[PDB]
Design a protein around this ligand. Sequence first.
Ligand SMILES: Cc1ccccc1[C@H](CC(=O)O)NC(=O)c1cc(OC[C@H](O)C(C)(C)C)n(-c2ccccc2F)n1
Ligand SMILES: *[C@@H]1O[C@H](CO)[C@@H](O[C@@H]2O[C@H](CO)[C@@H](O)[C@H](O)[C@H]2NC(C)=O)[C@H](O)[C@H]1NC(C)=O
Ligand SMILES: *[C@@H]1O[C@H](CO)[C@@H](O[C@@H]2O[C@H](CO)[C@@H](O)[C@H](O)[C@H]2NC(C)=O)[C@H](O)[C@H]1NC(C)=O
Lengths: 259, 155
Amino acid sequence: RAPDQDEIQRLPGLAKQPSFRQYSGYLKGSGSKHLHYWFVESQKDPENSPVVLWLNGGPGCSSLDGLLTEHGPFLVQPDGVTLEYNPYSWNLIANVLYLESPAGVGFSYSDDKFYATNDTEVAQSNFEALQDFFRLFPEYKNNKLFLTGESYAGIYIPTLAVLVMQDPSMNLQGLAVGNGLSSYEQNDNSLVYFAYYHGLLGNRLWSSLQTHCCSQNKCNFYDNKDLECVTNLQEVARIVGNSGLNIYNLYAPCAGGVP
Amino acid sequence: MDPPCTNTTAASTYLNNPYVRKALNIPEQLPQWDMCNFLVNLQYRRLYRSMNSQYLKLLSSQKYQILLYNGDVDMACNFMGDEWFVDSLNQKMEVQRRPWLVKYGDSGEQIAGFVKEFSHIAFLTIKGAGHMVPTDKPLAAFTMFSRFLNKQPYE
Ligand SMILES: Cc1ccccc1[C@H](CC(=O)O)NC(=O)c1cc(OC[C@H](O)C(C)(C)C)n(-c2ccccc2F)n1
Ligand SMILES: *[C@@H]1O[C@H](CO)[C@@H](O[C@@H]2O[C@H](CO)[C@@H](O)[C@H](O)[C@H]2NC(C)=O)[C@H](O)[C@H]1NC(C)=O
Ligand SMILES: *[C@@H]1O[C@H](CO)[C@@H](O[C@@H]2O[C@H](CO)[C@@H](O)[C@H](O)[C@H]2NC(C)=O)[C@H](O)[C@H]1NC(C)=O
């Protein structure tokens, strides 16, 4: 009915024992890949609550960031020892599956230790991992399935959802992507506009961008070959990503200070 | 191992504790836990440049509800790029862009961001949140997540 061997008995750092059952083990991916999962059952009606997969981006970043720092049942404190219960946990209304993916990410691994991969292989390995989850947890097969993710998971989730939609045994109901990479062109063009209107670039750099990168109204900051344009975009990339501004939150400080 | 301007020491110190690894059923022979694997990232071959075809394939069946949510103060994957992306999918049942509300204790109802809805797909902003929406705005993120699961309007 459930893998009793994967069940977390007493998790260190928790002052109170959880009201929900939680599991930590491995899901079989493609080839010799073993993906580490941490599954947190719903705090309210786990048997009927939806099954929600969570994937962090990178590529190469762990989904345990999602659990311990974002929306998990308990969050890690600055001491790196204490865990405090999260009153806004996504597991309050859902059975949340945090999957460290692809192989080599966090506790996930492969027998041959070859971690070179691509979008198509990752989606197929994640699909086989989901199939293994349903083999390990058969009581969750008919539950509403939602595929969720962050950043590069903007590629991970829709590609995985395309494979899941072809499998009628999986009760797919939807997908959610947080600050996701959906299009490189749409992201690159909007960021240059974001940078100027958030006061990171001046009128001199912007006038040069509008004159050289653009034609009347339409701007190309993605694959433009104009000489002054490529020069201006190199400066934009320096201000936005390598000047001391936190790219993940403009109004938050840069951890470790300005280089 | 750590992305710029980020500090992941707290989660790294916790997950690398031998007793935590034992409680999580981690085999002892496995290497140390890192938040982001540099070798996986370096060797990763990016294939797709746009998810346009994937979303249109998912929306064709009309069986799934799709949500794209972005913290509006993030620069890695800014809100505008994803708003442009959702709008470019040109879906039916286009709704007027509206703010979405969250009740904060005794501080009352507040605008948590803005919602742009179409048939089976909605784009949402999370006002004042960065790249990690549930870390920056946990109450707004839970409210949005609950409305998404229950197929309720985001407003
Ligand atoms: C910021 C962060 C913090 C903790 C966990 C995960 C993340 C995010 C992913 C998420 O939001 O789920 N990680 C990244 O945004 C990210 C991007 C990375 O690589 C940079 C790009 O590939 C680039 C060359 C196109 C600029 N990483 C990353 C991965 C492995 C090692 C170092 C890194 F910075 N990490
Ligand atoms: C990076 O994060 C770690 C962990 O949160 C910070 O270290 C903590 O600092 C506080 C205040 O001095 C202590 O109470 C904690 O016990 C420390 N934890 C650990 C695990 O050492 C660290 O200061 C942060 N570094 C930067 C540059 O922001
Ligand atoms: C994405 O990765 C997969 C898996 O590594 C690649 O597919 C394999 O490629 C090798 C070498 O050509 C073959 O021996 C295998 O039979 C392939 N497996 C499958 C399932 O097709 C794939 O070629 C990679 N894609 C790109 C564009 O690099």
